[PDB]
Amino acid sequence: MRVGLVGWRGMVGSVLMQRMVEERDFDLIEPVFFSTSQIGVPAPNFGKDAGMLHDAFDIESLKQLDAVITCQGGSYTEKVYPALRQAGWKGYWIDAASTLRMDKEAIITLDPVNLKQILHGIHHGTKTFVGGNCTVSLMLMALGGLYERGLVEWMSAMTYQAASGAGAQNMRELISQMGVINDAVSSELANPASSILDIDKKVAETMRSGSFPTDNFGVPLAGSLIPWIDVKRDNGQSKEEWKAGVEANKILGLQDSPVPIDGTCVRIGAMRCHSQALTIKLKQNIPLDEIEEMIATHNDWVKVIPNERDITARELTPAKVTGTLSVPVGRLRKMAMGDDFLNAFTVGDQLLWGAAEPLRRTLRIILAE
Amino acid sequence: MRVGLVGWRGMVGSVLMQRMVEERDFDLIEPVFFSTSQIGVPAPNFGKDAGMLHDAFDIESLKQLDAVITCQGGSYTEKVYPALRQAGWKGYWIDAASTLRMDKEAIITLDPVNLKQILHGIHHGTKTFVGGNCTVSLMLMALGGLYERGLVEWMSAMTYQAASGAGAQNMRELISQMGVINDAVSSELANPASSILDIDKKVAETMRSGSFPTDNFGVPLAGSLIPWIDVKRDNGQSKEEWKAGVEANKILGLQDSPVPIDGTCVRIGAMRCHSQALTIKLKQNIPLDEIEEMIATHNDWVKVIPNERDITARELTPAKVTGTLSVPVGRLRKMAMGDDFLNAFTVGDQLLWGAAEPLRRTLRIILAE
Ligand SMILES: NC(=O)C1=CN([C@@H]2O[C@H](COP(=O)(O)OP(=O)(O)OC[C@H]3O[C@@H](n4cnc5c(N)ncnc54)[C@H](OP(=O)(O)O)[C@@H]3O)[C@@H](O)[C@H]2O)C=CC1
Numbered sequence A, B: 001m002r003v004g005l006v007g008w009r010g011m012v013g014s015v016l017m018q019r020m021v022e023e024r025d026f027d028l029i030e031p032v033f034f035s036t037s038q039i040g041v042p043a044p045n046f047g048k049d050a051g052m053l054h055d056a057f058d059i060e061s062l063k064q065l066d067a068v069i070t071c072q073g074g075s076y077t078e079k080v081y082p083a084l085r086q087a088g089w090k091g092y093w094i095d096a097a098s099t100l101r102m103d104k105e106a107i108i109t110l111d112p113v114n115l116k117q118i119l120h121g122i123h124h125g126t127k128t129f130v131g132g133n134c135t136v137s138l139m140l141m142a143l144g145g146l147y148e149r150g151l152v153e154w155m156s157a158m159t160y161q162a163a164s165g166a167g168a169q170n171m172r173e174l175i176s177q178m179g180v181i182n183d184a185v186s187s188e189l190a191n192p193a194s195s196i197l198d199i200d201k202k203v204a205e206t207m208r209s210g211s212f213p214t215d216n217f218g219v220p221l222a223g224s225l226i227p228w229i230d231v232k233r234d235n236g237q238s239k240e241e242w243k244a245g246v247e248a249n250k251i252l253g254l255q256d257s258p259v260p261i262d263g264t265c266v267r268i269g270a271m272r273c274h275s276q277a278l279t280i281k282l283k284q285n286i287p288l289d290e291i292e293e294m295i296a297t298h299n300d301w302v303k304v305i306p307n308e309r310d311i312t313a314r315e316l317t318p319a320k321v322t323g324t325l326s327v328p329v330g331r332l333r334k335m336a337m338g339d340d341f342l343n344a345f346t347v348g349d350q351l352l353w354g355a356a357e358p359l360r361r362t363l364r365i366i367l368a369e
């Protein structure tokens, strides 16, 4: 099987390449690397000599592939995908971009949750598989056990999303802002007797100055937060908040009687892990022990963290989860509103299960079929 | 009126002193400054000569006062208050500490919300007024218009709390961690050709190293978050989470039929502003227009922000709010769950309305009556 890799050099592409090498996926395929700016240059060697970098916009060369995994971006897909399908290409298009996500011909891939849907799609001619919004994937990887049993009446999700989710330059900007903040008061901080209010005044002024690097976020992120991600929609939601409801329900195949999912998506100063504080209304008053069981047994990556202070601080955080495929869920308890109200706090790496991993897994499933 | 000041030198006390100077509160009282570390030397001069520093632990001295405003802390209140009351002192004790908050002889003070209760208390013998938990005060300052009309059935609050809530040293630690993170990749941070994954790798290692400065938080805060604040309670709640409901209902005078308030309190890398994402269940389907008016007209500090991307990014954040008495609230909209489900996001400075402001206002109220 000849598999084309587009967008392998970017952020999500690099995590994918790294994962494909670790799982030795290249041993199972004939890799062909593409580029939109380094055509002709020798292709990267991840174990196999793939030759030179091909032209990512050459529909005719793309047509000779059996599948394509693209991490290039939405505009790329919009430009190339239509022309490629129209050229008669019937190969598998595995995309990280949100472009085709809601197309009737496409399946949002998150196999630990919807393997059956994916298989039925493969067995019935579906050739387009798209990774879901990073936030949706991480939410379902944590609560799949509940949704799977149709136990969720509705769910409010307040998120704490990492800078990396907006882009590599956004992550760089976050760390730069951190340095600028510290630079401004490094002397005072070194002086044990310095005034905290003096340090505070200086930090606020620094964050508010024109020199503070905010090209990418538009406003400060380090030392602050931004309660709005992506474009505004007519009902007042941001596109980020809207995606949760429509994507989760498509993944679960609940379009006919969707579960209401809503909340506020907030950008915080975390590097690359998204965390979510959920208010889950259950259709029944299930004993907490059984709830923890349903959650834990859903997949190999979710992890129920005991509702104890010390352990929660050490394991239910971005510092702990970053760079791993682990999806811890903690603070599980019934809420003051009633025993059919379940509180849950989860953390997940949005570059792995939230981006690269489903693409990886989808190729292995297709190969296995 | 002779008023003793205890804890005027610390973080909260310093914010209080500056506010008392700005409002010219000292022109209406005879201030007596107390110390827990050194006496006999001249007291601070915030306008008028106040004499020497008095022994904050001397019962006889405290008995000579008409009131005491203390920001010293609970340890101090526990040592002094009981003895002072047992000694027959009937003066007003205005406290920033949580010690007496749920005491049957104490009223939690947040006059823009419960002036009536405070006045009633003063006219009927109540001599102890305690400022509420910062998160409670900030939430009620933003949503008072709704609670005042008994329109809230329940509310789920997911917070984003600043380092200052934990203390001056915690704020310093947050900034130091930011510096350590930046230092680790400072050299390549600005080079767009360097691997963002390698940068991420180094930041992750740095945060995980034993030498990362975590003496106060125990784990990293900068670049991460900690979904647990204060000690665990027998149900699944942390003490911080538990406070919200009991304190809010006491302030509102609904202890016999309380509004269920619950959620997860999370510490994030902000300096001195607490933000909250609320899922508000209304008892009736009220037009969003009326809700906005109700919220906006409740007090002089709440500020309702249009539900638009750019204005939200610049107005509804700690960067905007820090060091000010403004309490913006935005993202107001009905949720997918139904027209009686209201989403809201608010930000407030936890050292002002969340700590110092209620104390000086209570003093002014007592002076007037
Ligand atoms: N960030 C996240 O957490 C998530 C992102 N996604 C999606 O994944 C897709 C790709 O995102 P992302 O990987 O962040 O995009 P990047 O900008 O990091 O990479 C995309 C392309 O930009 C080109 N490029 C230009 N300059 C550079 C450079 N200096 N270094 C490396 N590549 C460069 C490369 O193409 P070429 O080699 O041809 O020049 C690369 O393939 C997007 O559609 C995004 O929405 C989905 C879920 C999560």
Ligand SMILES: NC(=O)C1=CN([C@@H]2O[C@H](COP(=O)(O)OP(=O)(O)OC[C@H]3O[C@@H](n4cnc5c(N)ncnc54)[C@H](OP(=O)(O)O)[C@@H]3O)[C@@H](O)[C@H]2O)C=CC1
Pocket (backbone or CB within 6 Å): A193, B006, B007, B008, B009, B010, B011, B012, B013, B034, B035, B036, B037, B038, B071, B072, B073, B074, B096, B097, B098, B133, B134, B164, B165, B166, B167, B168, B350, B351, B354, B355
């Ligand atoms: N931080 C926050 O956001 C909030 C705090 N609170 C409460 O306010 C109370 C006080 O907190 P906080 O103000 O942070 O306590 P601080 O540690 O900042 O100050 C308390 C006392 O420590 C002594 N002290 C010792 N060294 C110093 C120093 N180098 N500089 C200044 N003072 C020093 C002073 O007492 P002396 O002059 O007698 O030596 C001072 O009054 C607590 O009960 C807390 O729970 C309530 C809501 C919010």
